[PDB]
Design a protein around this nucleic acid. Structure first.
Ligand code: MG
Ligand code: MG
Ligand code: MG
Ligand code: MG
Ligand code: MG
Ligand code: MG
Ligand code: MG
Ligand code: MG
Ligand code: MG
Ligand code: MG
Ligand code: MG
Ligand code: MG
Ligand code: MG
Ligand code: MG
Ligand code: MG
Ligand code: MG
Ligand code: MG
Ligand code: MG
Ligand code: MG
Ligand code: ZN
Lengths: 37, 138, 204, 159
RNA sequence: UCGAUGUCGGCUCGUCGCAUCCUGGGGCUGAAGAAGGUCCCAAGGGUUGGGCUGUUCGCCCAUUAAAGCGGCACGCGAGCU
RNA sequence: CCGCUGAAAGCAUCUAAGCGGGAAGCCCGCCCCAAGAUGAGGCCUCCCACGGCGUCAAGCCGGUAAGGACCCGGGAAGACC
């Protein structure tokens, strides 16, 4: 998914970085691109 | 009952070089200067006191982040528009007015408040093409 | 920036050998400049222009012969061109060359109290099925108690026309500087005899 | 860094040497020093408003002096069918799949050196603008559109 | 509020919200391309003509890029029907 | 939404210092009104005594000009103005 309210870390490689308040998740596979919005 | 009153004293043409001060924190010095809340002659219905000339506008620094945060909505045009102006735009075009809008809320609301706002002569400084007369109160 | 003063004198379709281009005829006469509004005393870089010079001593206190060919001031009165800067004198039509677009700004034909269904193209009401005294009325002009007022930009009955209007991108199709005409393709606003300023293009 | 000639102002460290001058700002904190080319940059203040600026400027001054000692070569590979990047003047024209083959201008300090129509590199006295105008050239065509089109630095094609 | 707040719908005029139906961006896609799906920004502009019903709403017809969901006293009768 | 540079955390990360792209969206650009913008602007031009009543060119009038009205002929201006 893309924009959740609760953002998990469903991988081991999903970094949980935070770019201007929004708790993103980046990865190497793109399906894990969470946003917390 | 006694008699206390002031008389029409020749004004105080204070300059305020405002290179550093945050607006608001400056402007409540300016409004307290604009009303006669600093001379002990103060009747509240004469608009005595200072004719403040705050100069050296934009680079009025503001607080923590108010880069496109502080919204100057004020102008309801009149059918569909509350038109919004952030402080970046305000300091960009006619800077000149963030101080005017800062003191126009700290002055009172009646006709004495409106007369007192005409005393404040904001410029974008220096060289306010106005003066030879400057008790530059800092 | 390519400005002139002129008179809309009529319309005529002429032919560019293949079609019928329906031009009007602007009498963009030789307009003497009367004051070059400089940007260091005004801020404009504009130029006041003139028109027809036969004003038999109706020239009161704007007598103002401070230009070397002032051509005593027209009651076909002064207007501006806002970003102009000529180079010689009495700018004629040769500034315009056939094939360049112009914006023509003129006072439109006023229609008085041309009330609504004419001013704002309202759909009026039904001419039948029922009552009758609403055939050309605006109908509703708001909502009930909230807002409980008419919005201030409301379209209603008013003084239609007689305000300056600018048609942008009219092709200059020809000039006839044998009699100093200017021919643009389309509908220059105003009466056939009214005043139109003709400016440079705001294409680019 | 032997050939550099670094100088300090309050609002700016300023680096020089065998290529040119770079003018790197900093927060003026700690009244930081210099003894040689690479520096012990200073902080005693353990809070995060300074504990990261130290380290940031430790890498930034190093990137500046390395840019004057040739911090240059970011290599853009072009993959697939011959989307040739060829230099004309200094603004490079690369013909990637378009009706309008793209001419990319440099910012002042950067030149696009073109070895082949298979690869280009972007050189300049920086890392900031160098990565930026490798990035605009990669944004001419973001690569991985069901593979082998687009341009790459050294990235990894997976299906 | 019953010493009255006229009441459904349509017409007319609108204006606003965004929780968008197009249009402009974009992310993923079980995204070859064309499509599309879903989600994020995004009201600036739109948002058709009909048949039936008093109808709002629907069912259709022919389109459309889309034929938005609402609010504004289920907007609007000192404007009308 | 994607970046570049890069720490906090020797790796990376669009971000905390910075800086870039980027939406019909926002501001300005385009068109129109607009100095009643008491903040009442600017520019060009034209006209300029004191004789008269004081704690004085006198705050009040009478003759002044530059001009403006009144009126009349009108008008693709317009209900009147
Ligand atoms: Mg005074
Ligand atoms: Mg003075
Ligand atoms: Mg008329
Ligand atoms: Mg009708
Ligand atoms: Mg009736
Ligand atoms: Mg009847
Ligand atoms: Mg009742
Ligand atoms: Mg009652
Ligand atoms: Mg595919
Ligand atoms: Mg949204
Ligand atoms: Mg809408
Ligand atoms: Mg509605
Ligand atoms: Mg109702
Ligand atoms: Mg009724
Ligand atoms: Mg009613
Ligand atoms: Mg790196
Ligand atoms: Mg940028
Ligand atoms: Mg605007
Ligand atoms: Mg005025
Ligand atoms: Zn993952």
């Amino acid at each position: 998914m893309k924009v959740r309210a609760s953002v998990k870390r469903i991988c081991d490689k999903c970094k949980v970085i935070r770019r201007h308040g929004r708790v993103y998740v980046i990865c190497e596979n793109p399906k894990h691109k969470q946003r917390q919005g | 009952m006694k008699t206390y009153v002031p008389k029409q004293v020749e004004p105080r043409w204070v300059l305020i070089d405002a290179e550093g001060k945050t607006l608001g924190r400056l402007a409540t010095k300016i409004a307290t200067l604009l009303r006669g809340k600093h001379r002990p002659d103060w009747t509240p219905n004469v608009a005595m006191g200072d004719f403040v000339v705050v100069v050296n506008a934009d680079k009025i620094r503001v607080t923590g982040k108010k880069l496109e945060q502080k919204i100057y909505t004020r102008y309801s045009g009149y059918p569909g528009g509350l038109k919004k102006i952030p402080l970046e735009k305000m300091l960009a075009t006619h800077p000149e007015r963030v101080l005017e809008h800062a003191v126009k809320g700290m002055l009172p609301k009646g006709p004495l408040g409106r007369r007192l706002f005409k005393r404040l002569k904001v410029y974008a400084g220096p060289d306010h093409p106005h003066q030879a007369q400057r008790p530059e109160k800092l | 920036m390519k400005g002139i003063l002129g008179v809309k004198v009529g319309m005529t379709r002429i032919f560019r050998d293949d079609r019928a281009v329906p031009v009007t005829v602007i009498l963009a006469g030789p307009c003497p400049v009367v004051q070059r509004r400089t940007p260091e005393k005004d801020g404009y870089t504009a130029v006041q222009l003139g028109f027809l010079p036969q004003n038999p001593k109706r020239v009161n206190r704007p007598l103002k012969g401070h230009f070397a060919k002032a051509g005593v001031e027209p009651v076909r009165i002064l207007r501006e061109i806002r970003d102009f800067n000529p180079e010689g004198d009495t700018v004629t039509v040769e500034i315009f060359k056939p094939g360049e677009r112009v914006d023509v700004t003129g006072t439109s034909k006023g229609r008085g109290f041309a009330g609504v269904m004419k001013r704002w193209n309202f759909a009026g009401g039904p001419d039948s099925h029922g009552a009758h005294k609403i055939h050309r009325h605006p109908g509703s002009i708001g909502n009930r108690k909230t807002p409980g007022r008419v919005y201030k930009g409301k379209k209603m009955a008013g003084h239609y026309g007689a305000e300056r209007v600018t048609v942008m991108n009219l092709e200059v199709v020809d000039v006839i500087p044998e009699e100093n005409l200017l021919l643009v393709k389309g509908a220059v606003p105003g009466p056939n005899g009214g005043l139109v300023i003709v400016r440079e293009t705001k294409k680019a | 860094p032997k050939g550099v000639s670094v100088e300090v102002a309050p609002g700016r460290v300023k680096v020089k040497g065998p290529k040119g001058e770079l003018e790197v700002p900093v927060s003026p904190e700690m009244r930081v020093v210099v003894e040689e080319g690479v520096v012990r940059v200073e902080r005693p203040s353990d809070e995060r408003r300074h504990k990261s600026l130290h380290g940031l400027t430790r890498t930034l001054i190093a990137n500046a002096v390395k840019g004057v000692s040739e911090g240059y070569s970011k290599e853009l590979l072009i993959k697939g069918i011959g989307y040739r990047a060829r230099l004309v003047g200094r603004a490079l024209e690369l013909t990637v799949g378009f009706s309008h083959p793209v001419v990319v201008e440099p910012p002042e300090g950067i030149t696009f050196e073109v070895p082949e129509p298979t690869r280009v590199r972007v050189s300049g006295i920086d890392k900031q603008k160098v990565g930026q105008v490798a990035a605009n050239i990669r944004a001419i065509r973001k690569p991985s559109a069901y593979h082998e089109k687009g341009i790459y630095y050294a990235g990894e094609p997976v299906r």
